[PDB]
Amino acid sequence: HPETLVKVKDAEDQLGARVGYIELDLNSGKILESFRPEERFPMMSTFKVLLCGAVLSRVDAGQEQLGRRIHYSQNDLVEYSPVTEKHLTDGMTVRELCSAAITMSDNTAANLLLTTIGGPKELTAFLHNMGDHVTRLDRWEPELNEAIPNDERDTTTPAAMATTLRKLLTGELLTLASRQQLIDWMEADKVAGPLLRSALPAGWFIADKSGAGERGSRGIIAALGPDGKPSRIVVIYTTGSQATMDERNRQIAEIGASLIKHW
Ligand SMILES: O=C(Cc1cccs1)N[C@H](B(O)O)c1cccc(C(=O)O)c1
Ligand SMILES: O=C(Cc1cccs1)N[C@H](B(O)O)c1cccc(C(=O)O)c1
C-alpha cells in the first residue's frame, strides 16, 4: 500500500541507511509492494529458516530424520547459543535444533545443522537447486553477520528471499508435513517481539524470523495475516545505520503498523 511505502522511505531517511522491502501475496506469489527489491542485504539470522528448509528437504528424501540425535561438545559452542549450551550432556535432536535455530536464533544449533548438510556451500547449492540464484551463504555463525559494505557474502535480496520463503512454505518442493513444520517453527519465534509482532493486533497470525548483525544490520522475514492464518509474505532488511538497536527495531515496527493499518 502507498502509505506503507511512505513509511519505508521515512525509515530509510531516519536511519540514514538503505531499507529493502517487499510484500508478496502468499497464494499468487505476486508482488504487492516493494522498495529496493533487487538490492543486496546481509541475511543475518534469517538464513536459519532456509537452512531448516534444506534439512526438511533431506527428511522428505529419506536422507535425514527429525528424531536423529546430535551430540556435540563445548568446542562447538559459539556466541548466542541459549539453547544448545544447555544440552552438552544429552545432545539434541534435529527437530530440537531447528526449533532452537528458528525460535531462539541459536547460533550453535544453526552451525550443527549446517554441518549435517555439508556447510554453507551446500545450503547455497540447495538454494540454487530450487531456483534461487541470488541468495548465498558463505560463512558460519557468527562471522556471517560481518556486513562489510558491498561484500556479497551471506546476502540475499528482498525479492529473492520472499520468493524462496514462499516456495518453502507453499507448493510442492517440500511435503505438506514439512511445509507445516517449517511454518510452525516460525510461528513459535521467541526473539522477534520488538519487530512486526509489536504492532500485530490480537488475533493475527505471524510466522517469522528476525536477524541482527554488524554495522546496524537488521531484518525480518514473515508470513502473516488476519483471522489466525497467513496470507502475505513480508521481507524487510536494512544495513549501514548508526542507529541504536531500539531505533532500528522501532522503524521496523512502524513499517509493520502501517502494513496492518492499510491491509
Ligand atoms: O549472532 C549474531 C550476531 C549479532 C547479533 C547482534 C549483533 S551482532 N546474530 C544472530 B543472526 O542474525 O545471525 C542473531 C542472534 C540472536 C538474535 C538475533 C535476532 O534476530 O534478533 C540474531
Ligand atoms: O565505523 C562505522 C561502521 C558502521 C556502520 C553502521 C554502524 S557502525 N561506524 C562508525 B561508528 O559507529 O563508530 C561511525 C560513527 C559515526 C558516523 C559514521 C559515518 O560513516 O558517518 C560512522
How far is the C-alpha of 131 from the C-alpha of 96, rounded, in Å? 28
CB 207 within 8 A of CB 235: no
User: What are the φ and ψ backbone dihedral angles of 45, each rounded to 5 degrees?
Assistant: -65, -10
C-alpha cell at 147: 556486513
> Is the minimum distance from the CB of 230 to ligand 2 under 6 angstroms?
no
Q: Are 92 and 98 in contact (CB under 8 A)?
A: no
Q: CA-CA distance, 73 to 65, in Å (whole number)?
A: 21
Which of 83, 105, 156, 161 to probe ligand 1 with, by most ligand atoms within 8 A of CB? 105
Report the catalytic residues.
45, 143
Q: How was this structure determined?
A: X-ray
- Domain interval for residue 9: 1-263
Phi, psi of 9 (to 5 degrees): -70, -35
Q: What are phi and psi of 198, to 5 degrees?
A: -65, -25
Total of domains in the chain = 1
Which amino acid belongs to residue 215?
R
Ligand 2 atom index nearest CA of 239: 6
Q: Are the CB atoms for 246 and 218 separated by under 8 Å?
A: no
Check which CATH number belongs to the domain holding 35 and give it. 3.40.710.10
- CA 151 to CA 153: how far, in whole Å? 6
CA atoms within 13 A on the CB side of 156: 33
For the CA of 240, the closest atom of ligand 2 is 6
Say if residue 82 is exposed, middle or buried (CB neighbours under 10 Å; 0-12, 13-18, 19+): middle
How far apart (Å, rounded) are the C-alpha atoms in residues 28 and 235? 16
Closest residue by Cα to residue 198 from 243, 258, 241: 258
Collapsing DSSP states into helix, strand and coil, what is residue 55?
Answer: helix
- Ligand 2 centroid to residue 216 C-alpha, Å: 9
Helix (H) or strand (E) holding 70: strand 69-70
Whole-number CA gyration radius for the chain: 17
Q: How far apart are CA 94 and CA 55, in angstroms?
A: 9
Cell of 188: 513459535
> Counting ligands in written order, which one lies closest to the CA of residue 241?
2
- The verdict on the CB of residue 124 being under 6 Å from ligand 1 is no
Which of 63, 27, 23, 66 minimizes the C-alpha distance to 181?
A: 66
Q: How many angstroms does the Cα of residue 262 sit away from the middle of ligand 1?
A: 30
Secondary structure (3-state) at 186? helix
Residue 146 in contact with ligand 2 by CB distance below 6 A: no
- Residue pair 165/209 in contact (Cβ under 8 Å)? The answer is no
What span, in angstroms and rounded, lies between the C-alpha atoms of 126 and 107? 20
Separation between Cα atoms, residue 158 and residue 154, nearest integer Å: 13
- Give the CA angle between residues 156, 210, 79 to the nearest 5°: 95
Cβ of 210 below 6 Å from ligand 1 = yes
Closest to 223 (Cα-Cα) out of 193, 251, 186: 186
Beta carbons of 174 and 53 less than 8 angstroms apart: yes
Q: Check if 215 has its Cβ closer than 6 Å to any atom of ligand 2.
A: yes
Q: DSSP letter at 170?
A: S
HSE, CB side, 13 Å, CA atoms: give it for residue 263.
Answer: 17
